Design a protein around this ligand. Sequence first.
Ligand SMILES: CC(C)(C)NC(=O)[C@@H]1C[C@@H]2CCCC[C@@H]2CN1C[C@@H](O)[C@H](Cc1ccccc1)NC(=O)[C@H](CC(N)=O)NC(=O)c1ccc2ccccc2n1
Length: 198
Amino acid sequence: PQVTLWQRPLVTIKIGGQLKEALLDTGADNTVLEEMSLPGRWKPKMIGGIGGFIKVRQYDQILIEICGHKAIGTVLVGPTPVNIIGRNLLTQIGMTLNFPQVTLWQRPLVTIKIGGQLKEALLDTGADNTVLEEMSLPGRWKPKMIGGIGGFIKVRQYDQILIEICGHKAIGTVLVGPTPVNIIGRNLLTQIGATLNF
Ligand SMILES: CC(C)(C)NC(=O)[C@@H]1C[C@@H]2CCCC[C@@H]2CN1C[C@@H](O)[C@H](Cc1ccccc1)NC(=O)[C@H](CC(N)=O)NC(=O)c1ccc2ccccc2n1
């Protein structure tokens, strides 16, 4: 299957005998599922996202079927609003990002040029929006709040901003605020023809 990014890239998963929907998330290092019944031992862990941290239960060597593809890996369970399939499992199902083809054994980082400045950013199929660290941008902005796995942050919203993503030009909305990682979300991924392939 090839997947464009005009909509959230959702898949059906089977785990612990149960069926769920989950987000294919190139921006996530880990796989994090809403609270659910799994069998066996687990270790406590803390994981960060936009908004802060959540406590999760870590289950190792869990079998999961992702759209009919089997993988064994670590699954985290806790207070996430969305089930997310992260790179630890995406690699096991041959997932690639294409716009250059990009495997997911490492974070899919790209160089961007925005506001006359060069930065590195994460290609993030799990993000609806594009969120950049604090930086100087010109023009009017609007206040907004956006949510992530740890809660919410306040950002400045800039509309109709020109960004160059690995040489490919897009114009769209960019949010600026206290994110720890520059994130290219689906609003801009679609403009550079990014697709998920597995
Ligand atoms: C960026 C924004 C527009 C706000 N969108 C989102 O945040 C949506 C929100 C959704 C609902 C809540 C549950 C997660 C999904 C997926 N996310 C996108 C999703 O891609 C998100 C993007 C991201 C990457 C890095 C740092 C922060 C945020 N990744 C994550 O939340 C995963 C969670 C995990 N595997 O532990 N975070 C990381 O993989 C990760 C990597 C490095 C880090 C360094 C320092 C601090 C935190 C770090 N977190």
